[PDB]
Amino acid sequence: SGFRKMAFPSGKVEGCMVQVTCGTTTLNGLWLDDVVYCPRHVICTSEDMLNPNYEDLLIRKSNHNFLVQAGNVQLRVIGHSMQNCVLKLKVDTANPKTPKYKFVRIQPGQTFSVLACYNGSPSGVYQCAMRPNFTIKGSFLNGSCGSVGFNIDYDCVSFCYMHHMELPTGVHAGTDLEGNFYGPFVDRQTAQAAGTDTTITVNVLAWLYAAVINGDRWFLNRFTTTLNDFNLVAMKYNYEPLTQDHVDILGPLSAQTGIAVLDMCASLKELLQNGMNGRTILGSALLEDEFTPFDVVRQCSGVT
Amino acid sequence: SGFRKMAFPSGKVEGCMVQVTCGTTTLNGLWLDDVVYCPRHVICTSEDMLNPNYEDLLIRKSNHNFLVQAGNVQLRVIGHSMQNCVLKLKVDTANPKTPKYKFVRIQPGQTFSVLACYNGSPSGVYQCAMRPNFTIKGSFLNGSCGSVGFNIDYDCVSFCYMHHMELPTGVHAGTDLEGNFYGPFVDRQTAQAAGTDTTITVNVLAWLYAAVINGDRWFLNRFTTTLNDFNLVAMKYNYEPLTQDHVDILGPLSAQTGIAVLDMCASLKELLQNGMNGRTILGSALLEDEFTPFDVVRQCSGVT
Numbered sequence: 001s002g003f004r005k006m007a008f009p010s011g012k013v014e015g016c017m018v019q020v021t022c023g024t025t026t027l028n029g030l031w032l033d034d035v036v037y038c039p040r041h042v043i044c045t046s047e048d049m050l051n052p053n054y055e056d057l058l059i060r061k062s063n064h065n066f067l068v069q070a071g072n073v074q075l076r077v078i079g080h081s082m083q084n085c086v087l088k089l090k091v092d093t094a095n096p097k098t099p100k101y102k103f104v105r106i107q108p109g110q111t112f113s114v115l116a117c118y119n120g121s122p123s124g125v126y127q128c129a130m131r132p133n134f135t136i137k138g139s140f141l142n143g144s145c146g147s148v149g150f151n152i153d154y155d156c157v158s159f160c161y162m163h164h165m166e167l168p169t170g171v172h173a174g175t176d177l178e179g180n181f182y183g184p185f186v187d188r189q190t191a192q193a194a195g196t197d198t199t200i201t202v203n204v205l206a207w208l209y210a211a212v213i214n215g216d217r218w219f220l221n222r223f224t225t226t227l228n229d230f231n232l233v234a235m236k237y238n239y240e241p242l243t244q245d246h247v248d249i250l251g252p253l254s255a256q257t258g259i260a261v262l263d264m265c266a267s268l269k270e271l272l273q274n275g276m277n278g279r280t281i282l283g284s285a286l287l288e289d290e291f292t293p294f295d296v297v298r299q300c301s302g303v304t
Numbered sequence: 305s306g307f308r309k310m311a312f313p314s315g316k317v318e319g320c321m322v323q324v325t326c327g328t329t330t331l332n333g334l335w336l337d338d339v340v341y342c343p344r345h346v347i348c349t350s351e352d353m354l355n356p357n358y359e360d361l362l363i364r365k366s367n368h369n370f371l372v373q374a375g376n377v378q379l380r381v382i383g384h385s386m387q388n389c390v391l392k393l394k395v396d397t398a399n400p401k402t403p404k405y406k407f408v409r410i411q412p413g414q415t416f417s418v419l420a421c422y423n424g425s426p427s428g429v430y431q432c433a434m435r436p437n438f439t440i441k442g443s444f445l446n447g448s449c450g451s452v453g454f455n456i457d458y459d460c461v462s463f464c465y466m467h468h469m470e471l472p473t474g475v476h477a478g479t480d481l482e483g484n485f486y487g488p489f490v491d492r493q494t495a496q497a498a499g500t501d502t503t504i505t506v507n508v509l510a511w512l513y514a515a516v517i518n519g520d521r522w523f524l525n526r527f528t529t530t531l532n533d534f535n536l537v538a539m540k541y542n543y544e545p546l547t548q549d550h551v552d553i554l555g556p557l558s559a560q561t562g563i564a565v566l567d568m569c570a571s572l573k574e575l576l577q578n579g580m581n582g583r584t585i586l587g588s589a590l591l592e593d594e595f596t597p598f599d600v601v602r603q604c605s606g607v608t
């Protein structure tokens with residue numbers, strides 16, 4: 001029993017973190033096979049960042065200008081290329097600790113672990129979600145760029161995020177491992193405002209199922225609702241609309257607890273309308289939305 | 305910017321996790337050098353657990369009854385001994401991945417990372433604190449015993465906790481790596497009720513400093529208080545008394561923000577008396593107490 005905001009074990013990803021320096025800029029790189037992936041803004045000075053022409057800036061860079069260090073040892077760069085907003089630095093040595101891996105582009109609402117790094121060295125691991133406005137609420141200081149987000153399926157690491165940027169509102173933006181930003185963000189120090197950060201309804205419902213499984217049941221009520229009635233309330237509260245696909249995804253948690261998905265929607269509807277009244281659910285005074293239904297099943301079953 | 309409940313990178317500890325089986329019971333062991341540490345209740349059947357005499361039960365066990373598996377390979381047990389509530393299984397092979405390590409016994413209020421494991425395999429990593437009533441609020445299922453809590457200082461892992469038990473209220477109890485339980489708990493399936501779970505005042509104040517550093521400042525007020533006046537309010541709200549040692553510990557965060565510790569105490573006093581009024585601090589609707597002042601400095605500076 002007990003339910004925590006849990007990150008995947010980070011060891012497989014720690015073995016891939018390297019330091020990348022270009023000129024006076026140092027950030028993190030991800031070393032998989034004989035390629036080091038890093039944000040292309042490693043080539044920018046703080047001034048360049050205001051309006052960078054990456055193709056033009058990159059012309060002034062050669063393989064020997066990209067200093068890649070893995071632990072105490074230097075890696076030899078034998079090629080470099082730009083793919084969207086990431087640089088791929090081909091090195092002469094395959095990473096001996098390369099885990100089984102995939103590059104995946106996640107959808108909003110999906111969660112992942114972040115291994116925050118500085119100078120190619122891991123500092124911490126935390127769990128977060130791709131917000132519906134394509135930002136993430138991370139913990140990143142200067143030098144954390146190139147830190148990655150990932151999920152693990154037994155022994156295969158699916159890398160989904162690489163840190164690039166902080167918006168003036170303190171939220172974060174980044175790319176998948178193909179260098180494509182999530183959302184409309186660009187790697188330029190310009191006015192970039194995020195859209196509405198709606199709540200991930202399907203994740204709140206999954207977390208309410210985790211609460212019932214772990215003994216917090218005070219919020220269960222005698223009501224039911226329909227998808228359309230629930231969605232009228234969800235729109236009022238800036239919650240994402242619940243679809244029949246979300247209901248289907250919650251099927252196993254509904255089966256485990258015996259609480260029909262629409263009944264849990266009615267409990268959530270009352271929590272939105274009445275508030276918590278100073279009460280907590282799984283140690284939280286707000287409705288948590290950074291656990292997917294898969295995360296709840298995984299944590300409640302103990303998948304390794 | 306941004307502030308997350310962050311765990312230490314788990315790789316160094318993942319390299320130490322093994323599976324220990326005695327008869328029909330399987331749990332986790334911690335393999336450091338040529339010793340495997342595990343809860344002594346590995347020798348108990350579910351019936352034995354009601355009133356076990358460990359010394360007597362242990363007489364019926366030989367080295368060959370302790371099956372220790374590290375990954376896919378079996379370790380040879382060449383000795384076994386009981387130290388308090390842990391067993392130390394001497395194996396014939398030193399763990400090649402043994403990190404630099406220490407065994408530390410933490411005080412209430414101190415935080416640590418837990419690498420939850422099942423069958424010697426890591427499932428997740430999360431951050432928690434030793435509560436003032438000597439319980440921890442973890443996420444542990446059957447088979448998670450022997451999972452450990454730790455802190456890291458650059459390359460040295462300080463192991464502080466080993467999971468043994470869940471109380472009927474869903475909170476957890478365990479030992480340090482010398483086998484001594486935190487608090488008054490025993491490794492017996494008997495009526496064990498936890499005392500008052502007070503809030504760790506010094507940690508709430510540290511987290512309010514992290515909120516100011518990361519831009520959440522709405523709760524700052526025009527008031528100040530004294531330790532004695534603050535402590536009258538802290539007692540009313542089941543908060544731990546703040547001492548001059550806690551004030552001294554918050555000195556660097558006070559210096560960084562320019563907010564005197566007693567002024568932050570006055571902000572906390574008003575938050576306790578007035579509530580949050582539907583507002584949040586660092587994404588939380590309650591006052592968070594599982595970040596020590598050291599954690600706040602570490603996360604706000606990016607220590608690797």
Ligand SMILES: *C(=N)c1nc(OC)cc(OC)n1
Nearest residue numbers: 027041142143144145164165
């Ligand atoms: C990422 N490491 C990073 N670091 C900065 O300064 C040290 C600035 C920045 O701007 C995008 N990114």
Ligand SMILES: *C(=N)c1nc(OC)cc(OC)n1
Nearest residue numbers: 331345446447448449468469
């Ligand atoms: C710890 N792994 C554990 N597992 C149990 O059943 C599988 C019971 C238990 O009781 C102390 N501990």
